Amino acid sequence: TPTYPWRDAETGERLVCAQCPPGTFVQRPCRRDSPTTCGPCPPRHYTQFWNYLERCRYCNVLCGEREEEARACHATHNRACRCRTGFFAHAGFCLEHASCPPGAGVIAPGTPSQNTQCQPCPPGTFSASSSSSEQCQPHRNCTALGLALNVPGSSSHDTLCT
Amino acid sequence: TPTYPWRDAETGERLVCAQCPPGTFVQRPCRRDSPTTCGPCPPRHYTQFWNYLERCRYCNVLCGEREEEARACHATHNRACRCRTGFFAHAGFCLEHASCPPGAGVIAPGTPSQNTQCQPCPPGTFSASSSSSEQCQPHRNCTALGLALNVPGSSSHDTLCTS
Amino acid sequence: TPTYPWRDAETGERLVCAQCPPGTFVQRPCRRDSPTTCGPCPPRHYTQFWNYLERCRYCNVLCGEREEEARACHATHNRACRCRTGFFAHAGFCLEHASCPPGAGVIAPGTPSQNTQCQPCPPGTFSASSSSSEQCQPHRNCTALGLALNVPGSSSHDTLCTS
Amino acid sequence: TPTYPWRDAETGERLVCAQCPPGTFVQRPCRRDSPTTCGPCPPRHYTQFWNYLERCRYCNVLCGEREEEARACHATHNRACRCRTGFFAHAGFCLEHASCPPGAGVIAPGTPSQNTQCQPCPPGTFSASSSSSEQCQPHRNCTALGLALNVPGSSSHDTLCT
Amino acid sequence: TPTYPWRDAETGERLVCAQCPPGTFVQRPCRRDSPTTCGPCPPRHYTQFWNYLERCRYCNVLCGEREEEARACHATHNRACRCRTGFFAHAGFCLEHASCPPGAGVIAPGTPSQNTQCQPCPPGTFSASSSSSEQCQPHRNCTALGLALNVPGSSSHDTLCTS
Amino acid sequence: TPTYPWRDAETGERLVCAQCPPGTFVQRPCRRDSPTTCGPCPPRHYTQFWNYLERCRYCNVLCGEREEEARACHATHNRACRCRTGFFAHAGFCLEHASCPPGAGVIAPGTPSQNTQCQPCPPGTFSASSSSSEQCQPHRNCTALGLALNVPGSSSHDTLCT
Amino acid sequence: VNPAAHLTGANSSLTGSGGPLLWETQLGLAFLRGLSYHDGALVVTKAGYYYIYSKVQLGGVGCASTITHGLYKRTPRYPEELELLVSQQSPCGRVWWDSSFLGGVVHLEAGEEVVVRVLDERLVRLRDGTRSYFGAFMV
Amino acid sequence: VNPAAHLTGANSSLTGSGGPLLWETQLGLAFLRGLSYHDGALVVTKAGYYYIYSKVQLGGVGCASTITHGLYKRTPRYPEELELLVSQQSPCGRVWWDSSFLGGVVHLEAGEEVVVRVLDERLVRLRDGTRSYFGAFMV
Amino acid sequence: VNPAAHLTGANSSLTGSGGPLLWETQLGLAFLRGLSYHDGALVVTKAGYYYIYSKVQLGGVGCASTITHGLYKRTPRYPEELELLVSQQSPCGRVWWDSSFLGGVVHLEAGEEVVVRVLDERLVRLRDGTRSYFGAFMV
Amino acid sequence: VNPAAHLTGANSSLTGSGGPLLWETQLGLAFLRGLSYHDGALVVTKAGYYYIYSKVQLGGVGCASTITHGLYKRTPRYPEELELLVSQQSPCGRVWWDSSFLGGVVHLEAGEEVVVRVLDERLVRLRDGTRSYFGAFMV
Amino acid sequence: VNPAAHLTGANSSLTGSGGPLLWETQLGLAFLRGLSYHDGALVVTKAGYYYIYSKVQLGGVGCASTITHGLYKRTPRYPEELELLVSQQSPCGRVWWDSSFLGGVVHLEAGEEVVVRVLDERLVRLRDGTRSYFGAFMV
Amino acid sequence: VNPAAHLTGANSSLTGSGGPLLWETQLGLAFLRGLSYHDGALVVTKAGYYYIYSKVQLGGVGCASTITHGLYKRTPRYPEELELLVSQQSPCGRVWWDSSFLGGVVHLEAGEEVVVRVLDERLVRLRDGTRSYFGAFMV
Numbered sequence A, D, F: 001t002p003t004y005p006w007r008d009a010e011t012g013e014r015l016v017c018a019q020c021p022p023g024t025f026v027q028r029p030c031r032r033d034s035p036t037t038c039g040p041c042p043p044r045h046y047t048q049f050w051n052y053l054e055r056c057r058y059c060n061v062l063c064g065e066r067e068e069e070a071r072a073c074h075a076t077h078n079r080a081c082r083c084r085t086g087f088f089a090h091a092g093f094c095l096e097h098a099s100c101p102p103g104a105g106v107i108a109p110g111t112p113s114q115n116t117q118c119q120p121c122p123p124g125t126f127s128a129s130s131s132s133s134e135q136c137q138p139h140r141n142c143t144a145l146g147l148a149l150n151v152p153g154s155s156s157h158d159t160l161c162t
Numbered sequence B, C, E: 001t002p003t004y005p006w007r008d009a010e011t012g013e014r015l016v017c018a019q020c021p022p023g024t025f026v027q028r029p030c031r032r033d034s035p036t037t038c039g040p041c042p043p044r045h046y047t048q049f050w051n052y053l054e055r056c057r058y059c060n061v062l063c064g065e066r067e068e069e070a071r072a073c074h075a076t077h078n079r080a081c082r083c084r085t086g087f088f089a090h091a092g093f094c095l096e097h098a099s100c101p102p103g104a105g106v107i108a109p110g111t112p113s114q115n116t117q118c119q120p121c122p123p124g125t126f127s128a129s130s131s132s133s134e135q136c137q138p139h140r141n142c143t144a145l146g147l148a149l150n151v152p153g154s155s156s157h158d159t160l161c162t163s
Numbered sequence G, H, I, J, K, L: 001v002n003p004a005a006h007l008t009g010a011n012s013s014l015t016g017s018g019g020p021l022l023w024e025t026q027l028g029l030a031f032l033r034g035l036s037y038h039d040g041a042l043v044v045t046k047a048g049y050y051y052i053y054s055k056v057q058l059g060g061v062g063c064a065s066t067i068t069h070g071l072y073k074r075t076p077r078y079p080e081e082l083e084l085l086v087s088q089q090s091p092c093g094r095v096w097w098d099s100s101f102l103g104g105v106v107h108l109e110a111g112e113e114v115v116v117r118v119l120d121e122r123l124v125r126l127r128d129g130t131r132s133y134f135g136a137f138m139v
């Protein structure tokens, strides 16, 4: 238990008081006979560390419409926010996850902290649409289906077999 | 085994010739009495599919100063390229992995495909440096050390305790 | 009636042939004993002037997703395009009619050729909405209603009176 | 006549006074025996509404060098400004009216609140100069002048007849 | 004297012909019994080096409205261009010499190759004008005139003394 | 010697005192019997003009890492700064001297106040590198070395002779 | 005894109605000492000269492009707001941020009020009560 | 008769399937002379060397802000397209307009085809058949 | 009794001479209480520490590009202006607006003066006395 | 003899009349081989298919910030030009430089002409005959 | 007797350590009256409400792009800094300058401290003590 | 047999010597048919008129932000290159990409050569031989 120094409120005598733990604050300082009185934080307030504050800190964090609570207000910590589904964090904003155009495919889905990752579809694969989920898929393989080649494919269109 | 139509050159009979597999090309069409001769692709050339090319495709892919071979030229595929260490791919370039400034820390290191991911150090943690590896680290905890608080820390500077 | 020079094909006499009028083209040049045969333009083609083309010009004009036909393809003119409702022309595009923010009101609605015109609401008027139709409207007039002022208005919020 | 409440200046008694009309202000509050005294606004001042102000509002609006008065200071309203001839209003500035280049013509003149409107000159018409007034004009019609065609015209040059 | 290989046209003997000097071109190759005939370049053409062209190079250089001839078309060189007075060269344009605002003064006037150079007026000097010639000038010195200070000056306004 | 007016500190009598010269300040005002006492500026302070200041001005000018002192703090003037070698002054910053690319050459070196000046290398000259010093140099002249022409040069490469 | 206040950004600050911003008045850093509050307005009870101030934190993605941030007086003596201190800003010239601060001394009678407005309000970005706020003290 | 063609922008040119652009082959300026057409592709009937060319008119409003404009070969001998001549442009660097032009000589056998692809196709702005087009001639 | 003032933008504020801005001192929102004014300057009569402040509203069309807005002291003890609080701004980075605010506490003797300057002054945009102003109060 | 020509930028190229550009036809790199010239136009003397081409060098200082660069046909059969190959560019998106290139195959009869127009012409920057030009050859 | 201070930019202001800015406290325009200072912090000795303020002059060449400028309280009652007034700014949207000003009234006990931080500090540009500073006065 | 060639971007294309680009002449799409090659240059063996062409793919990260892309003639008759067809582009007006295309008809004698130069060469981005190239054919 850490302590703090306190010169008695009006006796004058110079003391060594117990601090209050996280989730509490100094409701009443320590005295001659009595130890520090620590009260629990009121709602919407907190203390994350040992302290001798006479008022808990206020849960002052606000989430915007593109955010949700990653953590709620609690006696031991402030609210915190993260980007909602479909958005990623960039310079304090929640931006929409990008989609990979035709000719390119998703190599990693967007998350709260990262945009869609994309790549040009390598040889033998394709993606025909703008999409934030769809990957590069291998071309239809004519020989393995025992068909003949009708139209060669490309990075943005499937190979056609008769 | 897929096929292509040909004609015997002595007689004119229609023939139904074998195509050639990945790694090879048609060096000689089929005849009435022998199969298609599939030759191996020469160095610096490839065929990735079953085919009836009369020459293999050239390994035409070139990697820049910031890239390296992700796959080499092989008989069955072209070369391919990726960014070297310290760079990530964006819009056909290899750009330098960003550094998280003071006040922020790496939550995912950079890769060939991804830039450094950063966040602002949450309460009770810090990062004093612009760095591309350093994470938000917890504040020196004075009460845990039994030492008095000297100077409270922040998102960008550690807490200082007395001795 | 304008003309073009020709030659009779049997004899060689010079001829002076009639041109063809808008909506038509020369299907057959004049001869010593008959006029130029002007044919009507086929579908999807036009001639806008007197002419001696041997085929009509194609109605080649294409309208985009934000446009519509201002004039149709007709025998005497090409098609032409304008912006649909809610859009105006700028630099060969059809852009969305702007909205006047709160504090401002429409003084001219948007047209195919013109964007929304806006002004800041002058004193004694307001507009609370970002809108592409709403004009600055006069404040509720408490003295005219015989009611006490509750909250004075502004350029972006109406005056409130008690009851 | 609307009214306002006024606690007598030093008698203490709590009254119901007549307000002053537009173009006036409260020169002297109402009393026991006497009604409100309303004075006319001094020059350079105004009141646009019924009021119990003890000083008229100041005609504080200023017009810049590209503006002129749309309305003067008057006892019942402030000055207001508009763009001078040859300028239009855009985001609080007076900008020069644009001109339509060669190949395009004016479909609406600039005004205080709107820029020049232009269009590409449609088929059969032309404009050869950059101008903020000149419209698309029909090509010289060779046949109607009984002349033959010398040089075909374009959206930016007149047709020539011999 | 540099040379070029030729062949006598009557016999076929190899010849070793003289090249032609700057300002000229080969009008007639050498023969067994006479030297190369070097003709002078016609108007609007040049040759800058020893050469064996059969026509001189054209003086193809054109100067814009903001430029003037630094060198004229001459038999031994093409024309060349520079910016007129009041302009300097940047990225193949001739741009207007900047003006130093109030608070700053010209430390080097503009040239064809250089923009106006400016600095902020150092203490005890001023410049009240946006100008492309005016330098920072020393403040009127009240003590030197035996007059009282009225209003202290600044970087952009002279000091004022009483009388 | 200029003067200033001073109403005696507590006698009340209204005087005409000598001012203090550059490099000094008023240590003690003038009195009945005694002239103004002027002290020298302490270190890190200055007065550039005649004055009746009771404290010298502070040498408050700071040079950044791309600058050096053009003048030091002195009793008669503030520090002043200029761009270090290799940088030129532009809108209050010290920028790196630019280099002239291949095909162009330096016509004036950078200075503290001016960027590198460059020109396209005129006919008969060349520069093969990006450099902030190298000028357009005349092509190697084959005829003057009694050699024959191997490869014609260009604005960015020297002429080759066998 | 010397009137003073500091009101902070709150989850209710942006009403979307065209009226003034609302504010927090008791929790965290917010407080009222010899001043009152009502529906967004600081309400004066002791007449005098006040230094009033506000800050609003703006931000957005790309570019309407012109933002007005102002302090306005309401008096019951006149049926519309009177502009006191105003700023026009075009920060959107692709995430961006910009802060606008205003301060100035104005005369306020007992019963008058001061409010803050921003047009367009949608560009105000609340985080924690420290980046947009509104305050005053008698001078 | 030397093979030549010039195919023009048309109503149906932008399929949105991720396959090649389609083109007008008969009306207005479009024509085919010793070359054929099938589903967007110039079809070669006489083997040799051809200068192939394409222009596409791009345009948009602000900012995959890199556009690929390419010509590609199809042969029945191999199940994938071969790139021939390709451009990358990022023209959105408000309204913008840009043109991308490509040409070059390639060797083509009978039965091979050439197509044009633009990714993203949505930035091609068709007007009249003069601003986007695809053609070739034997050299 | 506690010195205070707020001076506002006026049709005469921009002299174009390189000297300070002038201001309105009696009409509308402007006032002087225990401070004086002369040719643009607040003139101190009671010595002490003052919070001084100014705002100037800048605006323009496109881009010289760097603007200085400052508060300067004049004392009769020294023959040039002394810089107190200064800002450098490059807002022109095609209509734009930007506001610049400065505040700070400085020591001022009886007889000294404070002025406002902006270079280049042509970028200051007057509208109504609420967007550019200059004030002080003893602290 | 296969018809060919290449006409170059020249002193008189920019008329400012709103008519076509004019070109050098004999000096330096310019030439005519089985094609003629009249007032800016390539004049066709042998009917067939021609690849026509033009480049114009554009440049300016900041920002009708859309440039049209086009090739147009004139026939004595019809009193108006027909557009053949057209580009729109908005290159001013300080100093800038841009080149616009066009080519394609068109059918031309004897007595028809091809001209080049740039709107606005004032953005064409002539230097030496290598950066703006107009040519053609029969295919 | 009424607490007040103004601390100015100094050659030591930018430590590069991630901690607060340091400041000059006695020379030139800097001063302390009834307030103290220690390693960058204004230290309160008389409890009460204080208008605190800071300005920092930012500048750079081109564009990390987001700058935070804030005022933070240290109290010995809690082991980390408490944010009071904060601004986020993205001025780098090729030399640029921008100034950030903050002011607000906060409650401070005897023994508490106020500091200024900027991230990234490298963008602060010191010149002379007038462009970045930090001050307070009891209200 | 009509002379034709098409040379493609290759590993060694960018020498950095300030001399011409070099090119692949045999593999993939590259070929020579009645034209020769020496050190980057197309070497002419049959005199006549040739349409010459080149494309270079440019790209970079932000901003001699003007690129010159040109075709030049070398003749053993004169010790300096002659410019034929030249473009100036300033494409850096973050990642950018731009293509520069040139073509035109020039007269070439046997033993003359054509080279391609880009200044600054460092902005050419090689990929696969399809995006930068140099070719010609006799017309």
Ligand SMILES: *[C@@H]1O[C@H](CO)[C@@H](O[C@@H]2O[C@H](CO)[C@@H](O[C@@H]3O[C@H](CO)[C@@H](O)[C@H](O[C@H]4O[C@H](CO)[C@@H](O)[C@H](O)[C@@H]4O)[C@@H]3O)[C@H](O)[C@H]2NC(C)=O)[C@H](O)[C@H]1NC(C)=O
Residues within 6 Å of the ligand: A021, A022, A047, A048, A049, A050, A071, A072, A074, A076, A077, B124, B138, B139, B140, B141, B142, B143, B144, K079
């Ligand atoms: C210095 O060291 C001490 C240890 O000697 C340390 O004190 C600890 O503080 C933490 C963090 O504030 C406390 O952890 C909390 O404890 C309670 C239960 O006692 C939990 O309910 C808390 O809430 C968690 O639960 C939430 C669910 O609603 C979750 O969203 C979230 O995960 C919450 O954190 C929490 O775990 C802990 O009690 C003390 N321990 C002691 C013995 O005091 C202190 O933080 C250190 N100081 C510094 C400056 O780092």
Ligand SMILES: *[C@@H]1O[C@H](CO)[C@@H](O[C@@H]2O[C@H](CO)[C@@H](O[C@@H]3O[C@H](CO)[C@@H](O)[C@H](O[C@H]4O[C@H](CO)[C@@H](O)[C@H](O)[C@@H]4O)[C@@H]3O)[C@H](O)[C@H]2NC(C)=O)[C@H](O)[C@H]1NC(C)=O
Residues within 6 Å of the ligand: C124, C138, C139, C140, C141, C142, C143, C144, D021, D022, D047, D048, D049, D050, D071, D072, D074, D076, D077, G079
């Ligand atoms: C609530 O309702 C009342 C009506 O019961 C209304 O009061 C009216 O206010 C208006 C506007 O301020 C007054 O109109 C003015 O009257 C005088 C003559 O009495 C005119 O001279 C005024 O000037 C006009 O002339 C100028 C020429 O120099 C023009 O440039 C311009 O057109 C001016 O407006 C003006 O017409 C009117 O007197 C009263 N009426 C009464 C009976 O009091 C009030 O405005 C309403 N309140 C609200 C909040 O809307």
Ligand SMILES: *[C@@H]1O[C@H](CO)[C@@H](O[C@@H]2O[C@H](CO)[C@@H](O[C@@H]3O[C@H](CO)[C@@H](O)[C@H](O[C@H]4O[C@H](CO)[C@@H](O)[C@H](O)[C@@H]4O)[C@@H]3O)[C@H](O)[C@H]2NC(C)=O)[C@H](O)[C@H]1NC(C)=O
Residues within 6 Å of the ligand: E124, E138, E139, E140, E141, E142, E143, E144, F021, F022, F047, F048, F049, F050, F071, F072, F074, F076, F077, I079
């Ligand atoms: C009005 O006129 C008077 C003249 O009647 C004039 O006073 C002069 O002021 C100057 C400038 O401040 C003084 O010059 C200085 O004098 C001392 C020697 O006495 C020198 O050491 C000074 O330092 C120089 O040396 C430095 C080396 O460390 C150099 O870096 C630099 O070059 C320094 O300047 C300096 O020369 C001068 O003494 C007085 N003269 C008299 C007789 O008082 C005054 O400045 C004028 N007022 C205005 C407002 O312009």
Ligand SMILES: *[C@@H]1O[C@H](CO)[C@@H](O)[C@H](O)[C@H]1NC(C)=O
Residues within 6 Å of the ligand: A124, A141, A143, A144, B022, B048, B049, B050
């Ligand atoms: C297609 O299938 C066959 C037979 O199973 C195989 O040999 C071949 O490699 C396949 N092609 C690809 C690209 O995987």
Ligand SMILES: *[C@@H]1O[C@H](CO)[C@@H](O)[C@H](O)[C@H]1NC(C)=O
Residues within 6 Å of the ligand: C022, C048, C049, C050, D124, D141, D143, D144
């Ligand atoms: C030109 O005039 C004639 C005869 O009056 C008419 O028939 C024709 O349509 C006119 N052309 C145009 C474009 O109006």
Ligand SMILES: *[C@@H]1O[C@H](CO)[C@@H](O)[C@H](O)[C@H]1NC(C)=O
Residues within 6 Å of the ligand: E022, E048, E049, E050, F124, F141, F143, F144
């Ligand atoms: C090269 O040298 C010769 C002989 O000294 C001279 O006549 C000639 O003009 C020189 N060339 C140049 C470009 O100076």
Ligand SMILES: [Cl-]
Residues within 6 Å of the ligand: G009, G125, G126, G127, G128, G129, G130, G131, G132
């Ligand atoms: Cl906030």
Ligand SMILES: [Cl-]
Residues within 6 Å of the ligand: H009, H057, H125, H126, H127, H128, H129, H130, H131, H132
């Ligand atoms: Cl089209």
Ligand SMILES: [Cl-]
Residues within 6 Å of the ligand: I009, I125, I126, I127, I128, I129, I130, I131, I132
């Ligand atoms: Cl104003």
Ligand SMILES: [Cl-]
Residues within 6 Å of the ligand: J009, J057, J125, J126, J127, J128, J129, J130, J131, J132
């Ligand atoms: Cl040119």
Ligand SMILES: [Cl-]
Residues within 6 Å of the ligand: K009, K125, K126, K127, K128, K129, K130, K131, K132
């Ligand atoms: Cl500073």
Ligand SMILES: [Cl-]
Residues within 6 Å of the ligand: L009, L057, L125, L126, L127, L128, L129, L130, L131, L132
């Ligand atoms: Cl390539």
Ligand SMILES: [Mg+2]
Residues within 6 Å of the ligand: A100, A101, A102, A103, A104, A105, A106, A127, A128, A129, A130, A131, A134
């Ligand atoms: Mg995709």
Ligand SMILES: [Mg+2]
Residues within 6 Å of the ligand: B100, B101, B102, B103, B104, B105, B106, B127, B128, B129, B130, B131, B134
């Ligand atoms: Mg870090």
Ligand SMILES: [Mg+2]
Residues within 6 Å of the ligand: C100, C101, C102, C103, C104, C105, C106, C127, C128, C129, C130, C131, C134
């Ligand atoms: Mg509205």
Ligand SMILES: [Mg+2]
Residues within 6 Å of the ligand: D100, D101, D102, D103, D104, D105, D106, D127, D128, D129, D130, D131, D134
């Ligand atoms: Mg016009």
